[PDB]
Paper text:
The α-helices of H11 and H12 form a groove with hydrophobic pockets that serves as a binding site for prospective cargo proteins with an exposed hydrophobic NES. Due to the over-expression of [name] in many cancer cells and its role in exporting tumor suppressor genes such as TP53, development of selective inhibitors of nuclear export (SINEs) that inhibit the nuclear export activity of [name] in malignant cells has garnered increased attention.
Glutamate 571 is located in the [name] NES-binding groove, and the E571K mutation changes both the shape and electrostatics of this exposed region. The considerable change in size and charge resulting from this amino acid change may also affect SINE molecule binding within this groove. In all structures, there was no density for the side chain of Glu571 in wildtype [name] or for the lysine side chain of E571K [name], suggesting they are flexible and mobile in the crystal structure and unlikely to make any persistent contacts with the SINE compounds bound in this groove. Furthermore, while the variable side chains of the SINE compounds are likely flexible (weak to no density), the trifluoromethyl phenyl triazole scaffolds are well-defined and bind similarly to both wildtype and E571K [name].
Author numbering:
A (entry chain C): -1 to 376, 414 to 446, 450 to 456, 458 to 977, 981 to 1052
B (entry chain A): 9 to 187, 190 to 216
C (entry chain B): 78 to 200
The structure:
Amino acid sequence: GSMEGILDFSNDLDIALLDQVVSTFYQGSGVQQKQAQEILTKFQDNPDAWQKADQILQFSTNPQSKFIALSILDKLITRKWKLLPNDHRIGIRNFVVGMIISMCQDDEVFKTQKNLINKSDLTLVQILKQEWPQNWPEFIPELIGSSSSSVNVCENNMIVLKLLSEEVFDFSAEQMTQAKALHLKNSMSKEFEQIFKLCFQVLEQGSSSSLIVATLESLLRYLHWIPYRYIYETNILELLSTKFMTSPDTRAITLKCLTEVSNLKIPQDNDLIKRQTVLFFQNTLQQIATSVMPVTADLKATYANANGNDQSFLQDLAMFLTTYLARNRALLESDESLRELLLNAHQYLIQLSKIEERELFKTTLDYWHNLVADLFYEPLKKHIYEEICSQLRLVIIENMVRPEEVLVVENEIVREFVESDTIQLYKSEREVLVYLTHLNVIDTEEIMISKLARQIDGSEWSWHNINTLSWAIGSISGTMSEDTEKRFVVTVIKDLLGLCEQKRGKDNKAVVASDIMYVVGQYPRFLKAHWNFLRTVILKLFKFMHETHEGVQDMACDTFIKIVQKCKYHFVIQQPRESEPFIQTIIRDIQKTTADLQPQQVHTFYKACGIIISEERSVAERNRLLSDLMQLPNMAWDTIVEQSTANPTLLLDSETVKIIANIIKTNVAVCTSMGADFYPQLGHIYYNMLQLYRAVSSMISAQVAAEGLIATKTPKVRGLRTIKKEILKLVETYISKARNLDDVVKVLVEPLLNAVLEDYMNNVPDARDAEVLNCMTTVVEKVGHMIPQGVILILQSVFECTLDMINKDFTEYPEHRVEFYKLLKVINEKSFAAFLELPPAAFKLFVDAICWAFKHNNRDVEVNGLQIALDLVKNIERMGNVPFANEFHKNYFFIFVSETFFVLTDSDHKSGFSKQALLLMKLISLVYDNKISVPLYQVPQGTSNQVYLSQYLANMLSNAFPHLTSEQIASFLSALTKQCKDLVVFKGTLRDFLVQIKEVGGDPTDYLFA
Amino acid sequence: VQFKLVLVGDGGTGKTTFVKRHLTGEFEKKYVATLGVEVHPLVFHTNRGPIKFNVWDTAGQEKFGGLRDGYYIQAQCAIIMFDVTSRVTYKNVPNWHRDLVRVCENIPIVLCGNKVDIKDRKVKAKSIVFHRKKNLQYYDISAKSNYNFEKPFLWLARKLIGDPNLEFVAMPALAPPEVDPALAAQYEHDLEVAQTTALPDEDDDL
Amino acid sequence: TMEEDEEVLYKVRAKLFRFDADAKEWKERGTGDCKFLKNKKTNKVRILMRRDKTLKICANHIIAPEYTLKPNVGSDRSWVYACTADIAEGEAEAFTFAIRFGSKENADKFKEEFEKAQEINKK
Ligand SMILES: Nc1nc2c(ncn2[C@@H]2O[C@H](COP(=O)(O)OP(=O)(O)NP(=O)(O)O)[C@@H](O)[C@H]2O)c(=O)[nH]1
Ligand SMILES: *[C@H](CC(=O)OC(C)C)n1cnc(-c2cc(OC)cc(C(F)(F)F)c2)n1
Ligand SMILES: [Mg+2]
């Protein structure tokens, strides 16, 4: 409607209309809310709206209106303060100060408009950051004096001081120059004596809760930086650990203050200070025991009930106890009069560790790791904690989370999907339980065997109980002696089988199956020494591969390969009492074993066989095993190759396409585990495989021509491209592991390039496989140095056409993007001569492509782009004083300098700062080391490149950042060039520049910080 | 029974995609930066009745920040979002938290690490600790795979209603109606287009 | 919940899409269990589908005999069909749906069940 009128500034501002626009935004909805929002944004962003700020704060009926007005002032103070004439600066100051005093003295405004007062306090702090103490030396003394005139003013002054400390000490690193932060830190440090005096007196005499809470909230911030003497040479620790722990209004903030007190490393030679550190802990634990909860209390229940602030308090208690004890528990471990305090604090932690809260459990678990690792090494300590550790063993065992390997889940015992939050937690639990087992292996075995005895009984049978126990049992593998482990493992399995027999129903069955599979897969040392059992296990895994339950099936395959990775040797030798190596038995029945598996599980099976086969180091025997393993896919391959040459229409059948893809996938799986040993099988299919690659390629092109680009979405063409992708993956997989690189070059490479390069170049973009680039990257990486002409061929076939795919936006063809710059990186690193052979027009596109990578926010591309630029510079520098290097610098030195400066300063590429700074330092150092032997300019004759570089950069920055003074730019560049050998200082100067360009009037002496 | 929820975090962390997933069920693949704020109502059905969130989805890009902390006034809860594939977005979490709690001193806040579906994770689980001292709840999430996508709202609803046993429940499913040959000759225009527009993510499990 | 007066004839996990005719894009509407429910009183069969964790309805409409399942150019495990009266979001809207399944066999079984339900509703 008529809301836009406030945007017209030739008017007088209709405060009533502004308040209606504001009310419509905050309390409205729908389209009218959306319209008011856009209007308010335009109002706030108007460069003169701040001149309306006083009138809004005087005449408005809406607190949100005043808030927005203060945001307009904040934006002015933060960015354009020093452009104002001095009278406007004094006017804004007096006006903000006056409004704060005004709101404080009206008791009903003080109670009802907390946000608006908080926003005003922050606004005042922004003025202090610009004006204090140089142009406001009396702020702190007057603040202290005014604190006695009113309790409201005293409380609000604590808020101002809290915000001031935060802005100076907690959030200055990214927001101020190094010099300005140092100046404000020194200013606050110089005046803190008086500040602490006011703070301690307020805490000591104690007014009412609100003033105390605000004073403690300010103290929490001071503790981040103030000298230790203020805490230990006063009586404040006794106030914090007694008086302020008793009242729940101050308990939360005081516990956080004491946590910060605890996270200092005291001068640990002073007996007096050690006594005080003990004392405030003793006091605090006494207050909790008497005023909150005794150590026997059920904190799990309390947390779950979530009354009032109980969850936050228990979180804060855990942080306090873990912080203090990780630093200071040694202070409590020798004095016998402190033993009760030490163990009571850990007993609270035991109770806190039973809470059902994932993130809190991780906090306590981090502490337990800290403790048990120390008990594992430090002499004479573990006996102190014997009872704590015993309880902890029980807590961990009962709260084990599901490991990666266990693929069966309750929803209904089903088969997941999925993640790593749980994976990291399992690993952290295992770490602590392993330590705990070493600390007392008898106690651990007794807890686990007793728990397992009660699953037999049915005393405590449940899916949850057999799962966590089985997972804990598997997780401690390697902690016991081989003999105890033997007895331990035997008992566990026999009993787990006692649960299967006594369980009925498949739901129950797939649970105990996953548990047995996890345990056995975790104890390969046992399996290696007991062949007859290992054989029985594998046979049973094979049975599981025929299971109707889908989860059991997948885990059997994963367990099979997990065991084989560790016990492979026992499958390759002929065992006693056996007629042949077990690998021969496995290969023979591979068709019957894998009949009910999905294809990708079949391929895992073949990969597991490849692991075993590679343990045979006799070449003739290994190649024969390899030949036997591939019998089924090779037979299918020969059949499908014979009925593909004649009648090239046969691949129209989608069922044929699936068969081919599965054949290649099987070869990929075996090549993954066999690596260099796979060569004889690759050679068996290589030439016909590349002919198939060409044939499928013609089919794809034919479909796109007959059906349009939409053909690439159809199941048929997607299946054909899977063939090409798996062929490329197979060749990439082998070459990445090949040991005979002569064979790679003479046998594999040239037929490969003939089959893939022109086909990629001459397909429409939507039909090009990014996997071609990935395969070529590996080819260049491994044998690039031996095929200089082949690398040139690669560039000619993929460079310009892929670049044209990805240089219109940052989003299309994301995989081509990533592989493209991976390929350029390796060519530039390993076959730089291929770029020297490029025509000048194409080399310019290469420079264009590198800078294009700079501007990506995708880290995959950005990082490689910055790395290529750095390597390219080094490649050029390595050439020395030759025509190509001279021409490169004349054509491209300043392009790289300015492009790097652009992404450094544009606020859209912060993730690359470190590598951008490295590149810029290298470029600058090239000039100030006189490594560029020709003039960079086209300015008088004889001028050094150092002089021209400074003039170029000064002009560049003057035009790009016209609000900077000439002295700012000159001082920045002088410091930056001085520092081009010291990356850390260099980067600090760049950071200072990024601060200064966001405001007006930055001090040029800031760049002398170093 | 409605509550104001402000959603903040660096640009590109997935704030808008996360809300859209809860609004319509879709996954928006494109990045269209939010300008200032977008307000959407969002209702969940629980065993304690319906709960309505007025979700203020704010802009993460500084040049599009609009009213910035002006959007936080009278928020009753919040979600702080970052991207586990971008360390800078986690490094900025304390800055978003600072500005938020200066306006909203005592509200429940969830910290969400989004995009855990991406293989090359960069902000490791072990390094995510900022929530501990600040009493924020934390979740790994993925708007793309829906991993834990319901957990932030479920936790906030339990805190705002004050019932730890609150659960999402199935809404009542009314009987659907029994229901044009005037345009039936033209609902092959609209249908053939749909038939010949391929479905997205055909390689997914569903 | 409004589901006790009904019998479950068929259940399958699926991902449901809706066609944005303006933007020319398919948009996901929900993933979860798709159920064919036969009303005990009227014998009419409807599709009812809820999202996995929020349990929110993403499909609720009669399996009309007028409807026809069509293939999508990009999938061998999906069906496209027009719907004139779906009340998952509120007031009965018309939609062009696509529903995709875990496998071609699930899509084929769904089509068989979808057509057996159309017969039931033609009484
Ligand atoms: N792989 C993946 N991508 C996601 C996920 N969530 C969002 N994205 C993607 O991240 C990009 C950013 O989208 P968006 O939701 O607008 O983020 P935003 O924080 O709201 N942007 P802004 O704050 O500037 O308005 C999109 O391309 C989106 O597809 C996710 O969970 N996984
Ligand atoms: C219980 C689960 C089960 O039987 O699943 C079937 C498929 C329904 N159960 C019974 N027997 C085992 C068992 C026996 C083994 O003998 C050594 C080995 C295993 C294995 F897990 F190690 F493979 C399992 N499990
Ligand atoms: Mg957004």
